[PDB]
Amino acid sequence: GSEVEILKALLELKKSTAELKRATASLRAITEELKKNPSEDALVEHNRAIVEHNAIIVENNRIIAAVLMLIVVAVGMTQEIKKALEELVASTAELKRATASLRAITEELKKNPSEDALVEHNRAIVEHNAIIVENNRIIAAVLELIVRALNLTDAEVIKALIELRLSTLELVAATASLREITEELKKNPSEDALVEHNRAIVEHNAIIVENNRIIAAVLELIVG
Amino acid sequence: GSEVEILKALLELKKSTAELKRATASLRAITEELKKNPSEDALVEHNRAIVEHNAIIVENNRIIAAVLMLIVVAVGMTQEIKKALEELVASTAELKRATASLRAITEELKKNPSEDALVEHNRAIVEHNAIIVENNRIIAAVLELIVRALNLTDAEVIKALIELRLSTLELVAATASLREITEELKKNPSEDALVEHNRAIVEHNAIIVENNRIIAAVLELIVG
Amino acid sequence: GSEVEILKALLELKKSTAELKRATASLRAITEELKKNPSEDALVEHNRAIVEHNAIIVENNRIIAAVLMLIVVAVGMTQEIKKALEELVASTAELKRATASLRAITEELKKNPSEDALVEHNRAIVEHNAIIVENNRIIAAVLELIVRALNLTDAEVIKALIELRLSTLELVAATASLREITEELKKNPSEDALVEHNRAIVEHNAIIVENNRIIAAVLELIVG
Amino acid sequence: GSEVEILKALLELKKSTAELKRATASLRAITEELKKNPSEDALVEHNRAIVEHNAIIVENNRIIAAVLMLIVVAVGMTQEIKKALEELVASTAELKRATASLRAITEELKKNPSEDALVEHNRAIVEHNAIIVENNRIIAAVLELIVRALNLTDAEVIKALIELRLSTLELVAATASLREITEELKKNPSEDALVEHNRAIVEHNAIIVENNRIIAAVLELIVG
Helix, strand or coil: CCCHHHHHHHHHHHHHHHHHHHHHHHHHHHHHHHCCCCCHHHHHHHHHHHHHHHHHHHHHHHHHHHHHHHHHHCCCCCCHHHHHHHHHHHHHHHHHHHHHHHHHHHHHHCCCCCCCCHHHHHHHHHHHHHHHHHHHHHHHHHHHHHHHHCCCCCCHHHHHHHEEEEEEEHHHHHHHHHHHHHHHHCCCCCCHHHHHHHHHHHHHHHHHHHHHHHHHHHHHHHCC | HHHHHHHHHHHHHHHHHHHHHHHHHHHHHHHHHHHCCCHHHHHHHHHHHHHHHHHHHHHHHHHHHHHHHHHHHHHHHHHHHHHHHHHHHHHHHHHHHHHHHHHHHHHHHHCCCCCCHHHHHHHHHHHHHHHHHHHHHHHHHHHHHHHHHHHCHHHHHHHHHHHHHHHHHHHHHHHHHHHHHHHHHHHCCCHHHHHHHHHHHHHHHHHHHHHHHHHHHHHHHHHC | CCCHHHHHHHHHHHHHHHHHHHHHHHHHHHHHHHHCCCCCCHHHHHHHHHHHHHHHHHHHHHHHHHHHHHHHHHHCCCHHHHHHHHHHHHHHHHHHHHHHHHHHHHHHHHCCHHHHHHHHHHHHHHHHHHHHHHHHHHHHHHHHHHHHHCCCHHHHHHHHHHHHHHHHHHHHHHHHHHHHHHHHHCCCCCCHHHHHHHHHHHHHHHHHHHHEEEEEEEHHHHCC | CCCHHHHHHHHHHHHHHHHHEEEHHHHHHHHHHHHHCCCCCCHHHHHHHHHHHHHHHHHHHHHHHHHHHHHHHHHCCCCHHHHHHHHHHHHHHHHHHHHHHHHHHHHHHHCCHHHHHHHHHHHCCCEEEEEHHHHHHHHHHHHHHHHHHHHCCCCCHHHHHHHHHHHHHHHHHHHHHHHHHHHHHHCCCHHHHHHHHHHHHHHHHHHHHHHHHHHHHHHHHHHH
């Protein structure tokens, strides 16, 4: 793909440079030879027009190449985006499996409220949060790939990406804390440990909500 | 390149759709089963949070896919752009050759102002204008490819492209008229035919200037 | 066709320009000669009226040429449209043949439900979808030709065309995926492969429906 | 040009009609044969999707042909427009010659105010008005050609054209009256005849101004 397109852009720069050098040489040959006898009006006026036309063409070639380099840089990220998508697809499928599992657990817990079903409920919630964390990590990575691929410079998007990175650090640390709390609850289940675990979950969900808010802000800036 | 990236985007849409269907099924199973006994607070609150998280993830996947499709469409034009560049490079090289030829003719005409050298001058000028016309046709084509590749909707760029197309029609018709006038001058050279030819050249150059102005306006709109 | 009409428009521009230059020259000759003796009222008032009349005529010629250039640009696409129509006609005829084949297969399959008839049914469905994809590609191309020929600038039509291009990319990728799934079913037919294939068909039809919706929106915008 | 494009549109209508007939035949064969055994779900659902796809394609072909017929009708007027332009160009050139003649007369009359120069002045003014009348007749004709070529239905443009036709009748009658007055002045020149002639000129110019106002209104409606 871009391996050849870029080689052609380089060939274009070489040819427009050679054109510029030759057009400049005629510019000067014209001034020096025609000033000798201004009565040769057609020759000097035609050659000056030729020089202006070439100068414009060279400037246009420079601008066109400058734009195509942006298309080329977007093209060169095809494999990075493809891999980010493969990860996002696997994450989505895992999230779906966790949701179906949780639904089945909910039905079993309500129909037959065995303590084991409550344990399975909390386990499913922890798996779901781990999946959300992986999903948001993958999305943040794909957002960075999109921002880079589109060559965005908007200060608002850069700041939003910084906020996203910080919120993903907070989300990962909170996730690790939630997993440790769940394991401690499992080892020594109790009413106090269970209420502390439920509080840890509420705080974790609040963090996820903030992370999703930031992701939404980044997407809004990219789309709009 | 885009052949696989797009297949992955379609796979993502399939998976986010399956996730949405499953998240919806749990949304309803939760509401209907939990209203039976609101005292199971942890189960209903955790599952509602789960549903909100999935709904957000599905919406984000939709938006991300929508953006990546714009990158994919830009990527899919790689071969069209490569061919447009090959044409532009060949045109640039031909323009350079015409310029070098004209410079050599100018030097020969000034050093030895034979009538044959004036004839060669007018021939070189006509070849140069034919080259500009081919060059601007190629640039207009690459500009359309750029506008399509970047998915631009700005009304100003669309109008500028329309003006460009019209000016390229005017330029081609004027070029054909100039070639016919040159052939008539060559067949029956005279002072009156020569002055009419020089006027034809001035009008042609004015048309080229307008065509380049429009191209510059289009590039300004694309870059800025 | 347009080759001569445009040459005439250029001749008109040349003549209205010469008229403008001469009308301006009399404008000034009038001011300078008549201010010498304002008592020559009839001469100055008549010549001023003459100048205003010419200025109006020059402006009208400019506007008329500007409109006719839009008619000329629409005319110049005659061969591109003719070729797009030839493709659309061939596509329509092929779609008809596929439909008649499918009808005959349906009758044979219901009258004698041999497994081979089911295989032929799925083959006919795949051919039909391939035909729809070619038909919609051709229509999208003719829509672009119509939009360009009519010099439309409506932001809504430009956006609809962008959506169309993206949906045609999705449609082509889905079609390739459907063909591959059908080939895999043919090589290893089974109940699970057959149900997966039928699901692939349902998803493909949903994509076709969306592509047709976008095409309909574009046609609505062109007609209305 | 349009001779072939229109034949292709007719071929398209023939082929889309045949498609419609076959799609309808399968629609009915499907309903009647499948109701015999609704358990053949894949066959009935696939064929119903096939029928919907064909119905949509047929409606789209009808709409596309309806638009292309408007392009074809615009194309078919190429020779009428070309001839209107040839007339407008000849009119412009004649107007330029009259203007240059009037300028030379003005210079001669001011430099050497011979009675013969005043006679030539009034003659040149009458010729100029005759030229304006021919120019506006030609413009009104080209406006009618443009309105027909663009298939405009706007009530405002139709009314403006009616007003134009009426004003051109007034302009022609006034022109004939001015010519008769000029001939009477020439045969029996006098101060009273000269002042009556000058009044006739003022009234004629007022009529020309109104005719140009209407033409401008028509152009405004066509462009906007």
